[PDB]
Amino acid sequence: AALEVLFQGPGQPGFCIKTNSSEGKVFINICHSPSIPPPADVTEEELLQMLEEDQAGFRIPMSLGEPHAELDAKGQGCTAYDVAVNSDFYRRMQNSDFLRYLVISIAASGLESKYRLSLSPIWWMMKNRPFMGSI
């Protein structure tokens, strides 16, 4: 359901999701750029039907950035991934909890497939820092 887009960037930092793999803490940096294509423009109703017909039927263009190592708040090594979506789509995400969660699920599953990982469903949004890593 993630449609991967190779994008240089940087794009603009957005927010940062803390989860964990079978091997350590993982951070997903949700970023955005105009350069990334938006997904289909669809209404809430249309979207909910698609997810009924096909669980992964709403495809979202996003970059799936290469792993970058970082240190957590207790000085241990961990991985971060930068995932960028379209900037207008980003603004829609900010105004809808279910849409934003859907994107994060699709990103997490995208990274799982690409980097052969398993990620915890129990993630949390980091409240002070929009981005884990440098920029």
Residue numbers in the entry: 12 to 146
Please quote the paper that reports this structure:
Binder H33 is a small protein binder engineered by ribosome display to bind human interleukin 10. The scaffold was trained using the ribosome display technique to bind human interleukin-10 (IL-10), a cytokine of human innate immunity. Blocking or potentiating IL-10 signalization by artificially evolved non-antibody binders such as H33 could be an important component of the treatment of inflammatory, malignant and autoimmune diseases in which IL-10 plays a role. Therefore, a newly solved structure of H33 will aid in the design of new potent and selective binders.
The crystal diffracted anisotropically, and correction of the intensities for diffraction anisotropy was performed. Paired refinement was used to find the optimal anisotropic high-resolution diffraction limit of the data: 3.13–2.47 Å. The A0.5 data were used for final structure refinement. The root mean square deviation calculated on 128 Cα atoms is lower than 1.2 Å. The structure has an unusually high solvent content of 76%. This high solvent content is present in <2% of the crystal structures in the PDB.
